[PDB]
Design a protein around this ligand. Structure first.
Ligand SMILES: [Zn+2]
Ligand SMILES: [Zn+2]
Lengths: 186, 191
């Protein structure tokens, strides 16, 4: 969390709003944190990537993370690392495949993904994207209050001010988390 | 020239139906509940048998909640008709409160020749442990709980709405709402 260029409060509030059916958000935001196996250890690095939802998947923020992280692994000690993502939309199939491929070649990396909104949760291809990541060993969880607050504290230019939840935040969470759980069943 | 459910009921206004069965998962200012029931024999393709529309409010007292009106009506209906197995289906606009759930459960325990399927358009206060528990109380009594999807909304339209020949018109995101609600119901019934 220390020394990213933080995102501004308005960008966060707009892009991490967890209304389940939401139009006019063409942007994906990905905040990531790298740590060692140790939960008593500090963050080693942190990045914020933005990208568009449109199908030049090469520029989806998940793909930018993989490119960044690949280099980061080389330049650091070969050891087990815990990566956490907070992502405003869940990933597309292409990105899931690349992450899956990545996680297969790199078992010293374990990935936890927190998602504000499921992208196209009614469409089978984005449903499969979630299942692809699960099988590759990534956990996926819908963001609830604590994760939004964590993401606010770590990645947003909140200037000491506390996270303020928007209306129906936990209600949206209940719907989305049930839907994620359903999509990952069996 | 054949018998129809719509000839057995006093149909609701299409404006009443669109408003009350809109399946937006988080909806405020909708204090009314509509319950459409149909009674069938063991045969789902059998001729239309009986049907009734009940209305009420979500506020107490529970005694005039449509589910309680149904139970009184149906207790009487069962006496005025031949004894055999019956299957009841409800299309209900909000899911039931705990007091209604407990009363339906006791009814179902005492009349095991009756089974009940409840399709609900929306889960009422699904974030409140009391209304979550109502759902589990009904499931435990053997009621089949499902969320209304397109086919059920259409069937409800055909049978219980004053549509004047006109076809059921889906509102925006009906199937997306369905997915969210059906996952949430499944989760509340399992956990
Ligand atoms: Zn992607
Ligand atoms: Zn009730």
């Amino acid at each position: 969390r220390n020394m990213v260029e933080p995102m501004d409060p308005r960008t966060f509030v707009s892009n991490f709003n967890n209304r389940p059916i939401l139009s006019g958000l063409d942007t994906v935001w990905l905040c990531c944190e790298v740590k060692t196996k140790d939960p008593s250890g500090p963050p080693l690095d942190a990045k914020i990537f933005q990208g568009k939802v449109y199908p030049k998947a090469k520029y989806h923020p998940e793909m930018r993370f993989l490119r960044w992280f690949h280099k980061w692994r080389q330049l650091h000690h070969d050891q087990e690392y815990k990566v956490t993502w907070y992502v405003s939309w869940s990933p597309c199939t292409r990105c899931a495949n690349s992450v899956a491929t990545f996680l297969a070649k790199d078992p010293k990396v374990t990935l936890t993904i927190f998602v504000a909104r499921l992208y196209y949760f009614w469409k089978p291809d984005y449903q499969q994207a979630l299942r692809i990541l699960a099988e590759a060993g990534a956990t996926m969880k819908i963001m609830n209050y604590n994760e939004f607050q964590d993401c606010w504290n770590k990645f947003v230019d909140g200037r000491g001010k506390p996270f303020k939840p928007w209306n129906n935040l936990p209600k949206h969470y209940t719907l989305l988390q049930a839907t994620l759980g359903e999509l990952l069943r069996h």
